[PDB]
Amino acid sequence: MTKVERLLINYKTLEEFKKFKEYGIQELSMLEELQDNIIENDSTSPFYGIYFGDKLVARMSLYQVNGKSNPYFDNRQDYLELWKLEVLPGYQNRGYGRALVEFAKSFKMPIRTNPRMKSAEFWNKMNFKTVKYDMARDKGEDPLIWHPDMDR
Amino acid sequence: TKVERLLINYKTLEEFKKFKEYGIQELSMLEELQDNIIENDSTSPFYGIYFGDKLVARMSLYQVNGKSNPYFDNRQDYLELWKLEVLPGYQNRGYGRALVEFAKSFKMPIRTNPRMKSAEFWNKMNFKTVKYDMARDKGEDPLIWHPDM
Numbered sequence: 001m002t003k004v005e006r007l008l009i010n011y012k013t014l015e016e017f018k019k020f021k022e023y024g025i026q027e028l029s030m031l032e033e034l035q036d037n038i039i040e041n042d043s044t045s046p047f048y049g050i051y052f053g054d055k056l057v058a059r060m061s062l063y064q065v066n067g068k069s070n071p072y073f074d075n076r077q078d079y080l081e082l083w084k085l086e087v088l089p090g091y092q093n094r095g096y097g098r099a100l101v102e103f104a105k106s107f108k109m110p111i112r113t114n115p116r117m118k119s120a121e122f123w124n125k126m127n128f129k130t131v132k133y134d135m136a137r138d139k140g141e142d143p144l145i146w147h148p149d150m151d152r
Numbered sequence: 153t154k155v156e157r158l159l160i161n162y163k164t165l166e167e168f169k170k171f172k173e174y175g176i177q178e179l180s181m182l183e184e185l186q187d188n189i190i191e192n193d194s195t196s197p198f199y200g201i202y203f204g205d206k207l208v209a210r211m212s213l214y215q216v217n218g219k220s221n222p223y224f225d226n227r228q229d230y231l232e233l234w235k236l237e238v239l240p241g242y243q244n245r246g247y248g249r250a251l252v253e254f255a256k257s258f259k260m261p262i263r264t265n266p267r268m269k270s271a272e273f274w275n276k277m278n279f280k281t282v283k284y285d286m287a288r289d290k291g292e293d294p295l296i297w298h299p300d301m
């Protein structure tokens with residue numbers, strides 16, 4: 001009974017993000033936006049996460065992509081790009097990731113993700129499938145996909 | 153530099169398995185080769201550098217349509233650089249640079265999505281971080297280079 005929350009942006013949460021490995025420019029810019037406009041302290045972001053106690057313990061970033069110019073699904077439908085899916089050490093294999101994933105699935109929209117190489121078994125379980133490689137489209141990503149009428 | 157266009161064949165496809173950034177690209181190529189789709193010794197977006205008859209470094213380079221990829225001024229086209237890598241025992245000897253410089257030699261802008269810890273090398277190649285655009289980037293951390301005329 002560990003629920004998914006939309007994460008609010010603030011110095012505290014940005015501090016939490018530094019504990020995650022998949023940290024990069026999204027985080028840097030978030031910080032920059034916050035220090036430039038106070039009105040966006042305690043605002044929402046593309047991130048959803050799970051908390052144990054009051055520590056952020058697992059996160060995931062979500063955005064709906066225009067499928068018209070990203071040909072992944074049947075006759076070019078929009079899908080959710082899922083990224084930065086991560087659970088801190090000491091809290092893995094406990095189902096937080098699966099919980100975050102099924103949350104994304106609750107939107108009843110196709111999903112694309114570009115995972116880590118040493119965590120492909122986890123996605124096998126989430127019932128995602130490898131795309132057919134298209135060098136012009138995929139260019140050195142190894143995208144995984146999912147759509148309704150696969151694994152709820 | 154001693155850079156070279158890599159030719160697809162079981163021999164070099166085997167050598168690829170020595171590199172860590174190995175995925176579906178290679179997998180697609182292997183079956184395309186063996187299912188007779190492509191021809192033996194056909195070209196690829198890969199370029200590489202040998203030491204002896206051992207493939208030591210490689211990158212995949214491809215000209216991208218800048219219309220649907222707004223990364224540079226006046227939506228011009230650019231080359232996507234990826235899977236760039238050098239085998240252990242050969243790192244920090246110039247091979248990596250040699251490839252990046254081969255790419256740069258065509259005077260087109262270059263975009264690459266780098267590997268975690270490799271930040272410091274890219275900085276030495278004068279690649280710069282794009283001002284992050286969530287809709288465009290989505291948890292990529294793109295780096296761009298363009299020639300300064």
Ligand SMILES: CC(C)(COP(=O)(O)OP(=O)(O)OC[C@H]1O[C@@H](n2cnc3c(N)ncnc32)[C@H](O)[C@@H]1OP(=O)(O)O)[C@@H](O)C(=O)NCCC(=O)NCCS
Binds near residue numbers: 088091093095
């Ligand atoms: C990938 C990651 C998001 C999943 O962790 P998690 O959400 O707590 O895992 P879950 O409990 O939700 O996984 C669902 C199921 O898949 C399995 N699974 C999870 N991690 C796995 C692993 N890395 N290898 C093989 N199977 C795995 C689990 O056994 C789990 O239970 P079930 O199959 O019995 O139903 C998380 O471990 C992470 O943040 N990764 C860390 C860095 C990394 O990529 N390393 C992976 C190896 S440690």
Ligand SMILES: CC(C)(COP(=O)(O)OP(=O)(O)OC[C@H]1O[C@@H](n2cnc3c(N)ncnc32)[C@H](O)[C@@H]1OP(=O)(O)O)[C@@H](O)C(=O)NCCC(=O)NCCS
Binds near residue numbers: 237244245246273
């Ligand atoms: C970075 C990489 C892709 C190719 O680069 P390379 O061929 O090994 O390095 P090069 O000799 O061509 O780079 C030339 C310059 O980059 C610098 N450089 C390369 N890797 C570096 C690093 N990890 N940290 C600091 N500087 C680095 C070299 O010090 C050298 O600097 P100099 O000209 O001022 O003396 C290669 O190291 C690699 O495939 N490693 C993969 C593992 C990884 O990502 N970790 C980083 C290296 S341990």
Ligand SMILES: OC[C@H]1O[C@@](CO)(O[C@H]2O[C@H](CO)[C@@H](O)[C@H](O)[C@H]2O)[C@@H](O)[C@@H]1O
Binds near residue numbers: 051052053
């Ligand atoms: O207060 C009840 C319960 O909620 C927790 C964890 O779910 O609160 C966390 O989530 C809140 C939702 O916005 C955050 O405001 C808060 O920072 C975070 O702790 C726990 O604190 C508590 O057990």
Ligand SMILES: OC[C@H]1O[C@@](CO)(O[C@H]2O[C@H](CO)[C@@H](O)[C@H](O)[C@H]2O)[C@@H](O)[C@@H]1O
Binds near residue numbers: 159164204205206
């Ligand atoms: O023009 C070079 C010619 O020779 C080949 C092999 O016959 O050489 C390349 O590949 C070899 C390993 O497969 C390397 O030993 C060699 O250094 C490299 O040039 C062909 O690629 C090419 O037809």
Ligand SMILES: [Co+2]
Binds near residue numbers: 153154155
């Ligand atoms: Co030459």
Ligand SMILES: [Co+2]
Binds near residue numbers: 278297298
């Ligand atoms: Co530049």
